[model samples]
Target: TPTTLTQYIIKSQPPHSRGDFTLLMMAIQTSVKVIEKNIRRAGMAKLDVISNIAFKAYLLSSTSVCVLGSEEEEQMIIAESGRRGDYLIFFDPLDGSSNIDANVSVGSIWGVWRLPKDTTINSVEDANAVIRMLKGTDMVSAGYAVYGSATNLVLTSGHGVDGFTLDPNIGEFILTHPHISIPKKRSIYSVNEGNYGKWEPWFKEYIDYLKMNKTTRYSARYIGSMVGDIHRTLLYGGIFCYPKDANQVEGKLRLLYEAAPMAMIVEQAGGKAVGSNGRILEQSITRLHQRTPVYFGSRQEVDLCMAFRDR
Candidate 1:
């Protein structure tokens, strides 16, 4: 049977590492429970927004139990906090929802990390505190749970990428695969190619290279939903891009809500994540929902993309 969240926490062999995985396990359970209800009736419509709204609502209401939330997910201030160790944790309730009705894949993403010893989940009124809290560099683990043909959870706990299949009958996540790593080489790449004209020279050149090089023979696929796109990249060894363009000059994804958690997971899975120019975790947040460009995938691909951005 699936281990309960409390079981995962209490029985976590190392004890110290329990917080990181236990929270992940808990959130996975939460997603499974909620999505199961969602499947029977709605089939899928705006799953990301709907799941996030419900999941964050649970997080907001369960503060007395879990006590970790942001201003966007909750109303009160989170208490001053610090990473227990070299890892921090993130919770993204939903990833791709627009295709819910179409029976396409969708899920949630999260990251865990070690923070700078002064993180807090307090009121949004304290903008400085929010900024000081999630600098991103402290991430250590990350992953996501996809609801599609079956319930699958993929994760990288800084050891290697592991995927679990949810046994609904037993309510347990069975380890079906272990130590999965993206090969150094990948074929297709994912990006919102519609924004090509609005992109800077570096991005345009990179895409042109992909299109021109027969040896590279890069195929392109973009679902326009981060969770779905990133999910494919996570498993199939491709790239996922959410970057700044002329139209998205400020950035496209919220640092905490999207990048931080994904950064931690990608790094753990033996992959990498970068903003428009550098590592996503290296950037510090100046606001709760500060926008950032995220480009990440197999280590080689991400590094190459980062190099493209630099030039």
Candidate 2:
């Protein structure tokens, strides 16, 4: 019998790890479904706004989340009854929406950190301090839902990565790919080649090396959707790069909502995630909207990227 997402949680995820986490996930599951519907018929601009609303609406009503960080919002959203919830969440409600006009894959990303039980917040500074002090390593769980030809919700709860596919017939996410792990290496690479001139010389050289590898050629695939690219990299095995270019030294992906969550998923799947200065999973977040360079995927592939930097 196929496992339902709820039982999957109650069975493996210990209650003390983060109580009511399953409840939060239920909210996420509902949001995934709602967003999937809009992705089928809505425009890119409209879809982006609605997706954010969908996530916030369902998640806030779940009674499991307190503080929220979203890509669409300029500031953090704190629940009035936040003291009742035990989780702090960050999310990119609809990542890679830029590709929606062409009907390319787009999806949502999120990370969860459990706050101290009965923790009190005196002011906005207290909330800011809490998120700033927490590192990606402190995350309790993370996940993303990719909406393409099919919708898949993949996640980890400080355990191994697992994937669930949405069953249209039943409106439920069923466990289909369990204990997913990335291959050590693959003959595929994903990056935005249009920025070749913007990258540093060493980075450009690495791209050339991959392109010039006639014997073991690497396929170049960039769909402009971070979630889609990451989902492909996670399953098929390869590297996905969003390096800091000449124009944006800080990088493009949001740390809390995008980079940190995906970093946790990749690492849990027996892969690696690296930032320019440190491991993505080890980064201490300084701000809610700060960005960082990321190169993550198969273990061997990331090692190669690190070698290029070292040399």
* Alpha carbon lDDT of each predicted model: 0.64, 0.88
- Give the runs in model 1 whose Cα sits over 4 Å from its true position: 1-12, 15-24, 43-50, 57-67, 70-90, 112-131
User: Against the hidden reference, what TM-scores do the models get?
Assistant: 0.80, 0.95
Number of the top candidate by lDDT?
2
What's the CA error at residue 216 for candidate 2, in Å?
2.4
Tell me the lDDT of candidate 1. Answer: 0.64
In model 1, the number of clashes is: 16
Deviating ranges (above 4 Å) for candidate 2: 15-19
Q: Distance (Å) between predicted and true CA of 192, model 2?
A: 0.5
lDDT of 1 by residue, 112-211 (tens): 4453455533334553454455566655556777777777777664566777777777676767766677666697799888888888888888888888
Kindly give the stretch of ten consecutive residues in candidate 1 with the minimal lDDT sum: 79-88
